[PDB]
């Protein structure tokens, strides 16, 4: 759809749509930028991620409202509308996974980009898993697990424990464990060692990096407080 617009204009308009809270537009602009074929900078990867997380975030929130109504009732209308939203959500997840597979991940050599894209891959398979009920549910769960696990292996080899991508990856993999894989003990163990090893590496950081890392550590702490 965006093939006739300059890459740089797509990026510029992506930022404008973020300011205007037009995240569907923002996602379409970043999709167009990705399809230019060039690798994405650190800032551009964030823009892509913010756009689609917000789009899929509203679809997940709506799916949960509708699936809760549907459960409390079990005419076809509630099921039909939940299925409509669910289908739209799956379409957005498939689009993100398609962009990662064509060709963001295969061209990502640096740990920061490769971990970032593998984290996204795990997240969007997680969102697919949240709505899955058929024969492919186990396969979707394992795809999320496989992406997260490769990201974790790289991040532990290549990044310091306070690295924000590393910390966000561990946070989300632990949510996966708790929420999708029925492994609350694995979720708690990962959140705690991630938090403890980040604590020990804070002394190496500047004030701004310290602020970045402790923000995400506090989300790990919030979950540990919820889960124990």
């Amino acid at each position: 759809a965006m093939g006739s617009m300059e890459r740089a204009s797509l990026i510029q308009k992506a930022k404008l749509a973020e300011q205007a809270e037009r995240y569907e537009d923002m996602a379409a602009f970043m999709k167009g930028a990705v399809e230019k074929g060039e690798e994405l900078s650190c800032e551009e990867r964030n823009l892509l991620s913010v756009a689609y997380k917000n789009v899929v975030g509203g679809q997940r929130a709506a799916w949960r409202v509708l699936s809760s109504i549907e459960q409390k009732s079990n005419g076809p209308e509630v099921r039909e509308y939940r299925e409509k939203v669910e289908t739209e959500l799956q379409g957005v997840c498939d689009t993100v996974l398609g962009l990662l597979d064509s060709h963001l991940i295969k061209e990502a050599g640096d740990a920061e980009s490769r971990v970032f894209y593998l984290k996204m891959k795990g997240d969007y398979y997680r969102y697919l898993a949240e709505v899955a009920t058929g024969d492919d549910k186990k396969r979707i769960i394992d795809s999320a697990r496989s992406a997260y696990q490769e990201a974790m292996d790289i991040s532990k080899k290549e990044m310091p424990p306070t690295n924000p991508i590393r910390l966000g990856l561990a946070l989300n993999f632990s949510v996966f464990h708790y929420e999708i894989a029925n492994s609350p003990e694995e979720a708690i163990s990962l959140a705690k060692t991630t938090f403890d090893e980040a604590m020990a590496d804070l002394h190496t950081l500047s004030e701004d990096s310290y602020k970045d890392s402790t923000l995400i550590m506090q989300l790990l702490r919030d979950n540990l407080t919820l889960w124990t």
């Binding site: 966000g168 946070l171 949510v175 989300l219 919820l226 889960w227």
Partner: peptide
């Protein structure tokens, strides 16, 4: 219910 990266 739990927090993923926000």
């Amino acid at each position: 219910r739990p927090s993923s990266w926000r």
